[PDB]
Amino acid sequence: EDWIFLVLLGLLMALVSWVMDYAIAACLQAQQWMSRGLNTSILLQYLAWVTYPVVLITFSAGFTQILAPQAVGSGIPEMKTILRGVVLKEYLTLKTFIAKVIGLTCALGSGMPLGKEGPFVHIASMCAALLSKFLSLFGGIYENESRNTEMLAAACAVGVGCCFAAPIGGVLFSIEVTSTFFAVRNYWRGFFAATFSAFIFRVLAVWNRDEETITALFKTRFRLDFPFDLQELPAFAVIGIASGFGGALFVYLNRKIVQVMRKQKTINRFLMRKRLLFPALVTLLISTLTFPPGFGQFMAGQLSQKETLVTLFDNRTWVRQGLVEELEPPSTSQAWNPPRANVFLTLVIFILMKFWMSALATTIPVPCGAFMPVFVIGAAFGRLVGESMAAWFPDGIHTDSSTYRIVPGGYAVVGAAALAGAVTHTVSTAVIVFELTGQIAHILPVMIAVILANAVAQSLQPSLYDSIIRIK
Amino acid sequence: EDWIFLVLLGLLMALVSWVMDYAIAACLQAQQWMSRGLNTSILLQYLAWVTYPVVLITFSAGFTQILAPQAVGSGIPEMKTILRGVVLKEYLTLKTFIAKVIGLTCALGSGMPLGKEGPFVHIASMCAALLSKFLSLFGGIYENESRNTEMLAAACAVGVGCCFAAPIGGVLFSIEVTSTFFAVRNYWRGFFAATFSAFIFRVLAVWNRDEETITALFKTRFRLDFPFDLQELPAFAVIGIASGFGGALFVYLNRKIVQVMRKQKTINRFLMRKRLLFPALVTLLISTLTFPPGFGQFMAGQLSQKETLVTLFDNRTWVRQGLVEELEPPSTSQAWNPPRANVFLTLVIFILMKFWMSALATTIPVPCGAFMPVFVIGAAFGRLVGESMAAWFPDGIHTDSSTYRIVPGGYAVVGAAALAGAVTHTVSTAVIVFELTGQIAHILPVMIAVILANAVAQSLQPSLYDSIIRIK
Ligand SMILES: O=C(O)c1cccnc1Nc1c(Cl)ccc(OCc2ccccc2)c1Cl
Numbered sequence A, B: 001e002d003w004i005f006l007v008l009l010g011l012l013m014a015l016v017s018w019v020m021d022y023a024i025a026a027c028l029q030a031q032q033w034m035s036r037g038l039n040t041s042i043l044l045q046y047l048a049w050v051t052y053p054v055v056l057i058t059f060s061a062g063f064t065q066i067l068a069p070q071a072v073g074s075g076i077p078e079m080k081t082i083l084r085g086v087v088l089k090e091y092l093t094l095k096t097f098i099a100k101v102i103g104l105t106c107a108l109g110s111g112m113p114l115g116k117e118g119p120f121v122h123i124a125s126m127c128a129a130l131l132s133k134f135l136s137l138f139g140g141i142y143e144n145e146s147r148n149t150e151m152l153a154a155a156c157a158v159g160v161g162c163c164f165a166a167p168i169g170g171v172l173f174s175i176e177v178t179s180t181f182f183a184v185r186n187y188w189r190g191f192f193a194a195t196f197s198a199f200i201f202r203v204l205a206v207w208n209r210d211e212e213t214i215t216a217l218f219k220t221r222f223r224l225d226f227p228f229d230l231q232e233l234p235a236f237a238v239i240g241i242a243s244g245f246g247g248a249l250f251v252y253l254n255r256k257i258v259q260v261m262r263k264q265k266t267i268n269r270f271l272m273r274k275r276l277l278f279p280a281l282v283t284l285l286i287s288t289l290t291f292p293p294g295f296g297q298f299m300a301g302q303l304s305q306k307e308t309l310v311t312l313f314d315n316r317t318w319v320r321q322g323l324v325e326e327l328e329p330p331s332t333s334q335a336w337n338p339p340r341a342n343v344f345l346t347l348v349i350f351i352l353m354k355f356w357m358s359a360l361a362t363t364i365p366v367p368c369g370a371f372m373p374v375f376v377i378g379a380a381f382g383r384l385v386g387e388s389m390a391a392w393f394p395d396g397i398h399t400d401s402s403t404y405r406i407v408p409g410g411y412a413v414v415g416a417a418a419l420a421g422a423v424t425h426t427v428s429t430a431v432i433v434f435e436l437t438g439q440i441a442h443i444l445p446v447m448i449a450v451i452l453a454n455a456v457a458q459s460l461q462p463s464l465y466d467s468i469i470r471i472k
């Protein structure tokens, strides 16, 4: 009766994930349509572009504080505490489940630099607990606490699996973050349920008729002959160490932002009298800084996070598109080539802004995750490094008198994986990024970058989830 | 230090793996040249083909018994015992290390259906212990016994990773087979060491000009558009279930062979007088049954295991080679198409023979593994199922007015991974075969097959390593 439990958990989690992503996509496309329809006057465009995300964030914060304040936060450190031995039976409730799902949907739909891995693992845990309660009516054997904890761990595995639609990588990431001593029985059960969840993904995508044909979400078409050369290994290692430092700095900045917000007595009081004003103000600041015909021309503000990542994972070299772009349509990568600034300038501005934007927006009293923003920052960093390597020498690396240009998409993949692993202190981001793209040709650079990033991060700073568990 | 320990462990283990593989390749190519030399007279080549493997196995058995009998066997169950608390200072000695390396090389060099997953990880354990002794001799700071067991686990990770040249999959396999409760810290250390070992392996492959550059071992060219169709999923499920049954049956047959051989009083007497005769007799039987112009024409007897697997994992469809043999060169796949028998008969005879051949040859008093033989049988079974599906569906399944043909190579991959996981009771064979083939297009079929095979195998029979630990 355990296998049917896992199958039901996977099915329900798959349905919840798909409906949430449909709602988020609808919200973003509605935002884009509203922005495009009011192009007659710039002031009306600015007013819409500012008020919309502010409205969504304010509504999300308000609904969460009315219904269930405990749902606010990432959700991974709380489950680490739960699996540590502290039982918060009140913290997994149906009201909290509704609050979490609606708040996460509305927060991600506003275009804020937020993630979804923590909220998704929390929702998966809640769904497992609720389904266990629902099946408890038929038999009281289900109330044995140890097996409930085991099934909660399996639920964390399922949640991380359905978040990225990467089953094995998700299970490994959940193993890495939610536990310290882990039984192989739980690994088997979690990967069992993640298999069925990923199968429901595929069958639903086929029955859904989403795109032109049945294709991948993060299509990568890198050549398999020479994905990378041997001379690029020092560059990949440098990316790894830099991402480790960046992850440690990101955790440090997030912790000091929380410390400043808590410590300043006058600021804290002025906030707690008008607690809804803080999310509105931060959304105001960010959305003002991301106005497409304002400052968003320097930050690719017309693209959402998924579009930004897809554009960054392109196989074309942007620096050399000045010669081989006469028989090809204008790619979406044009957003990274503003008329007055080169690609390097917009890349460095995007990094230097989105870093603090994500760090500050993670602390907002809304259900949010921190994986996706850091992943995007790492991908952009890797893309910048790859474009710099292409610009240094455009003929490529000489080898056997055969030409092969540098592919900066692999650099972006390596940078994203390294920065995410550095922030989360995990090694499973290497397996996740292969199942995401679908190509494992860059296994050597990704692994080398991830180990170096984790080593440096362990040398400097604790994990973001450990930071949360310590400050909360 | 720990980091330098892991670096040295990876370097030494990769060097040992490469030199052993070079020796095995030299032995096989010398045997092939000797066979080709005496083509004129059938009797002379028959005598050579029979005596050469017999000579190798008798020398291996004699050297192992004279030097260190403890090295005889797989090597994984004894390490499970070591990591279960019972530590014996007999299995880790320099003489045992020499005996193991020489015996394993000579046993794999004869073409016997043997693997390299068990002895090659016990070799890594020996290397870790020996280098730890070398460092302890230079200072009394290493007297602590608390620094070994985790380092032995890291050594098992490194060995299993370097066996397949699949670092992450190897680490996961070692986690699954060598432990029950395992901490993520040693996981991180093993991942670091395996990464550095893979880097050394690939840079060595570049320098010594064996292959062109850093590449895969079983490079495959499956198309990325539609690797599989949804109608093909039940076929993959059937492959998985049948592979689970086959793995349970293989374990059962191996155990019963051991029991019958050990129990019979007369056979025990012939053992205690003529122990060396048994490997010679079994090698006689197998090599007689695999004579290329004798019975080997029905079993691809001229193919060694590595190139057998390479031929099995090809992207071309053999059943339709009767119409598309005008624009392609004659491939090595012709060995599966003897003039008098069709492909299906060759596949079924090969399966029904190699099953018992591998099961019986695993019991031989020589250092051997059981992963590669079972993996080859699974790959052949998957290829048979894929070609059967192609015969059933001559034009494939046309979707949206377009035609995409069936690819039986993915079926072979799925079958190999499923039956290997069924035998070993492990789910990471999917990651192993992803890192081997280099394509993650078939993640869902192989994942479903591994799930089903492991489920059925656990339902009927214990794992092969558990069988060995119980009988021994
Ligand atoms: O960008 C959008 O408008 C969007 C629209 C529909 C669905 N998702 C979207 N973005 C998104 C967000 Cl915000 C958070 C998580 C996430 O999971 C994939 C992933 C990608 C990289 C790292 C870790 C997870 C996705 Cl795809």
Ligand SMILES: O=C(O)c1cccnc1Nc1c(Cl)ccc(OCc2ccccc2)c1Cl
Binding pocket: B021, B024, B025, B028, B108, B114, B115, B116, B117, B163, B164, B304, B305, B306, B307, B371, B372, B375
């Ligand atoms: O066939 C040969 O003559 C040969 C020549 C050189 C090197 N290896 C050879 N074969 C071989 C053997 Cl016997 C055992 C292990 C193994 O590891 C790869 C592997 C492949 C599949 C599953 C698990 C491990 C290999 Cl490649």
